[PDB]
Amino acid sequence: STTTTGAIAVTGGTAVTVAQTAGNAVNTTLTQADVTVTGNSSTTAVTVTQTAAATAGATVAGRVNGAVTITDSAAASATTAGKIATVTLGSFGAATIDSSALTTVNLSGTGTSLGIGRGALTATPTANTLTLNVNGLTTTGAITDSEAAADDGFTTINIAGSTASSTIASLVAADATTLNISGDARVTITSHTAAALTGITVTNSVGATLGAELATGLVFTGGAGADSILLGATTKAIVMGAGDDTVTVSSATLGAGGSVNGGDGTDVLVANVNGSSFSADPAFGGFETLRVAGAAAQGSHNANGFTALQLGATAGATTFTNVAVNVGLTVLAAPTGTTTVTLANATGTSDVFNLTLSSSAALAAGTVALAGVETVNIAATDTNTTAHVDTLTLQATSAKSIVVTGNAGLNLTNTGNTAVTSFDASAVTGTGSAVTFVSANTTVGEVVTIRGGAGADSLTGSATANDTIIGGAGADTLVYTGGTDTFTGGTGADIFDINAIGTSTAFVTITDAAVGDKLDLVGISTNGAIADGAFGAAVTLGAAATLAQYLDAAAAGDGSGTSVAKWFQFGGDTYVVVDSSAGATFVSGADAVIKLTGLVTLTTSAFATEVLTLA
Amino acid sequence: VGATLGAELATGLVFTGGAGADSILLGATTKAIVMGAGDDTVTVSSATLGAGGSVNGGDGTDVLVANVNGSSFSADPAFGGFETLRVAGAAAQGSHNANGFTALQLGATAGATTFTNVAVNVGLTVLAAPTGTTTVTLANATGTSDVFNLTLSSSAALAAGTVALAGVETVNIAATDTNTTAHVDTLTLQATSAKSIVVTGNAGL
Ligand SMILES: [Ca+2]
Ligand SMILES: [Ca+2]
Ligand SMILES: [Ca+2]
Ligand SMILES: [Ca+2]
Ligand SMILES: [Ca+2]
Ligand SMILES: [Ca+2]
Ligand SMILES: [Ca+2]
Ligand SMILES: [Ca+2]
Ligand SMILES: [Ca+2]
Ligand SMILES: [Ca+2]
Ligand SMILES: [Ca+2]
Ligand SMILES: [Ca+2]
Ligand SMILES: [Ca+2]
Ligand SMILES: [Ca+2]
Ligand SMILES: [Ca+2]
Ligand SMILES: [Ca+2]
Ligand SMILES: [Ca+2]
Ligand SMILES: [Ca+2]
Ligand SMILES: [Ca+2]
Ligand SMILES: [Ca+2]
Ligand SMILES: [Ca+2]
Ligand SMILES: [Ca+2]
Ligand SMILES: [Ca+2]
Numbered sequence: 001s002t003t004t005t006g007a008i009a010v011t012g013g014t015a016v017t018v019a020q021t022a023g024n025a026v027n028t029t030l031t032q033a034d035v036t037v038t039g040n041s042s043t044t045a046v047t048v049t050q051t052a053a054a055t056a057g058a059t060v061a062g063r064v065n066g067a068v069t070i071t072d073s074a075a076a077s078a079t080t081a082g083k084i085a086t087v088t089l090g091s092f093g094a095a096t097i098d099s100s101a102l103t104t105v106n107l108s109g110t111g112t113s114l115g116i117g118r119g120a121l122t123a124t125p126t127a128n129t130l131t132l133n134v135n136g137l138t139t140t141g142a143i144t145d146s147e148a149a150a151d152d153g154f155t156t157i158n159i160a161g162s163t164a165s166s167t168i169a170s171l172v173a174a175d176a177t178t179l180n181i182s183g184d185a186r187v188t189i190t191s192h193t194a195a196a197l198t199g200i201t202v203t204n205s206v207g208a209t210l211g212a213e214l215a216t217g218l219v220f221t222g223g224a225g226a227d228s229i230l231l232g233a234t235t236k237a238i239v240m241g242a243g244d245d246t247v248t249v250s251s252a253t254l255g256a257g258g259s260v261n262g263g264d265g266t267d268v269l270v271a272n273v274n275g276s277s278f279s280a281d282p283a284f285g286g287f288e289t290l291r292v293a294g295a296a297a298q299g300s301h302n303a304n305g306f307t308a309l310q311l312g313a314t315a316g317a318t319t320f321t322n323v324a325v326n327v328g329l330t331v332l333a334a335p336t337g338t339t340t341v342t343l344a345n346a347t348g349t350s351d352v353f354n355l356t357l358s359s360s361a362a363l364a365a366g367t368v369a370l371a372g373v374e375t376v377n378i379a380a381t382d383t384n385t386t387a388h389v390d391t392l393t394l395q396a397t398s399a400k401s402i403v404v405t406g407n408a409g410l411n412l413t414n415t416g417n418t419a420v421t422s423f424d425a426s427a428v429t430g431t432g433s434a435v436t437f438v439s440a441n442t443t444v445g446e447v448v449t450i451r452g453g454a455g456a457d458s459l460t461g462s463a464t465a466n467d468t469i470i471g472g473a474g475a476d477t478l479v480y481t482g483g484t485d486t487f488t489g490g491t492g493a494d495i496f497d498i499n500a501i502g503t504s505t506a507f508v509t510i511t512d513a514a515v516g517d518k519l520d521l522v523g524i525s526t527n528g529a530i531a532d533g534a535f536g537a538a539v540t541l542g543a544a545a546t547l548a549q550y551l552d553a554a555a556a557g558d559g560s561g562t563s564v565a566k567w568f569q570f571g572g573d574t575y576v577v578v579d580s581s582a583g584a585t586f587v588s589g590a591d592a593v594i595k596l597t598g599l600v601t602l603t604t605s606a607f608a609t610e611v612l613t614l615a
Numbered sequence: 616v617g618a619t620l621g622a623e624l625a626t627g628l629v630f631t632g633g634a635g636a637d638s639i640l641l642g643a644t645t646k647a648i649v650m651g652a653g654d655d656t657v658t659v660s661s662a663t664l665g666a667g668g669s670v671n672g673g674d675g676t677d678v679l680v681a682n683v684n685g686s687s688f689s690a691d692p693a694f695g696g697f698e699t700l701r702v703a704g705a706a707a708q709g710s711h712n713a714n715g716f717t718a719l720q721l722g723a724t725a726g727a728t729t730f731t732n733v734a735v736n737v738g739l740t741v742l743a744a745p746t747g748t749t750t751v752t753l754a755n756a757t758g759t760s761d762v763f764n765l766t767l768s769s770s771a772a773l774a775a776g777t778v779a780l781a782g783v784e785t786v787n788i789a790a791t792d793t794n795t796t797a798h799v800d801t802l803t804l805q806a807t808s809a810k811s812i813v814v815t816g817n818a819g820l
Contacts, residue, residue: 257758280714280732280754302732304690304714322690322712344690348667 005033005066012040015047022051022063029062032093036069039084039099046070049090053110065093065110072099078122089114104131107166113141118151128175130154134187136164143168148175156180161187161204181208186226202227207243213250222263234258240267240286248294252276254283262286268310272297279305292318293333303327304344311335328354331365338367338395346372353377357392357408360384367393374399380406380428387430396420403427409434409455416440421448426472428453434474441465445483452476456492461485463500480508488512495611499523501578504551504588509595519576519612521565524592526580528562534606539568547571551586551593555579559591565612567602574600576612617653623660632673640682644668650677650696658704662686664693672696678720682707689715702728703743713737714754721745738764741775748777748805756782763787767802767820770794777803784809790816 056062272294293312703722
């Protein structure tokens, strides 16, 4: 049903299990049953399972969870023992337990809040260890020790994560002293409120992450596996253990003394600060990667002695100084202001930098400046299965090569990068990992090579240059600007967008024009706008007519008021002409020729607007 | 014993030292400068070299002199084999990365000069009157037993000027006279958490 599951109450028994399910339809919401268990003095264990909560979607069955209330016999007594030792939950709304004999809680699925009270026993309790086994648990809100506030709570909390990731939105334990996170799968505590904590100790294989910034007085010890914390001006010796760990610091220098060692493995140090020099400070050790990310992250950062660099969202413009050779930057989120990299030594002529862009969604990497680097390698990386296009302004005024790899698109702003003679995005991979590039090269008579990838790419050369442009798979747009250009749109419906007139010597050759490819002549319509028909009888001349003769023949008509297209086949190759002139001379200046390698018959092929589609 | 050349070498010009204290001035050098054994001394007029464009101090304790607006020589693999960083010259000034040096020196300067990322047990020797406040900031000042060794070393009376040592608890000053005829050095110390000042030496302060 969509109408909600009515109460469930149990009283008494050696052990109790109430197992709800919800089987409602795919666009409805059923809210589940309120459960109450009240033990008699035989009740050692209680279990209350439900179906996991979800939001009513197009194909998602909606479920809200029922409150659960568990109460032991001796819950209100000042003296009587109490019998409920273990409680197991499998999803829940606003849950309560109240038992002075409680040691273990097993959590699972989707929760709202758990409030743990112990019996109102007046005697001061001696055993005060909450074992809290988690497995696939996610919480809207707080696990609280209700007893700790005004009475005698648990002094030591143990959390054993198991077979699946768990996330506790908030853990509130005001009498807690030790906190040990153990087991088998990640435990994440988004926010703890445990002022009296003297230590935290991860022993867990996958690791533990704590989203709340630790107390400056609070010791933390990691184990194997990716543990992950936030520190301020710490007073204590923080150890991170083995595996790939992550500490975020809110202040650049520590305090008292006041240290943090990353331990074995590749560990990230995150600088949420106005500048850093972590290599210098012996207080920090065992770190390999420096990441600049956070709401206070900004300014000048000493890269020295790190083997890798990362960047996330930032407060303002951030600069990496003293960057050693073979050290690459990975950008993980949109930063604020220009990101400058300045290397240890830029002076050589074979300088290589590895920039990486790595995100699940479209990433606006912003401006990164790489003065004195000759080869710039860009990886554009998508972390999920669904395709996107990243954006970057590169300022690399002495780069000769740009190579793009990866599996996401890159629209690259290239303004002012005038040394670039080789753009190679050929290795790029998705349906639409679309690469956009425009050469900023102005060296007269240069050889420039532009390579597209699997995406629907948009590659523009330079009027200055003899551009070789090659799209990969997909709907590529190759732009002609001037000079002796060689175009190859690979597989797919490519568009050869002709925006310049050229000469009789400096013109575009299109190597592989085939059925489906287009020839956009909008930009050479000097006088008016082209044919518009299916204009398709080849100009024919004699067995030994010259290219010069065929050109003159093709331009014989009057193009003064209205430009006209014609075409011919000379010496084994196919040519297209735009006549924009009076006399029967093809005039180099305003009349235009386009070469197409091979015999391609344009008989049946038709002019769209000023756009010729090969038939 | 060595050779010393007071003129700045041509940027095109190769130099090779032997054993013994050789000593030159370099600009934006284009060539691979070697200094050999013994306690050598190169003064650079520009912070980064050129073309390529390197200078190796070789064996022994060698001084690198920064006649520049800031330095970070540890980072640049173009410079290697140096042990002491001195800030001295008519263009010498600003922020200087002490990292990876085992000693520090100071001479006459263009303006206020700052030593950053200074490792523990690294001392400064002042050799001539500088211009503007000389700030030392250590790698880690946070402890409560921080010791710094300042030395003043001259033949004549030396006006060391202001040196700032934020976060140092014990400041040791040596006042050293290099000749037989007595003098008195002068210093403004700014050491707002120093509990001890110990003065040794054979000249006045
Ligand atoms: Ca109570
Ligand atoms: Ca009580
Ligand atoms: Ca209490
Ligand atoms: Ca660890
Ligand atoms: Ca580690
Ligand atoms: Ca360090
Ligand atoms: Ca490590
Ligand atoms: Ca994606
Ligand atoms: Ca370079
Ligand atoms: Ca560059
Ligand atoms: Ca392509
Ligand atoms: Ca061109
Ligand atoms: Ca293509
Ligand atoms: Ca094609
Ligand atoms: Ca056009
Ligand atoms: Ca004509
Ligand atoms: Ca020598
Ligand atoms: Ca030497
Ligand atoms: Ca040496
Ligand atoms: Ca070096
Ligand atoms: Ca004297
Ligand atoms: Ca101190
Ligand atoms: Ca002090």
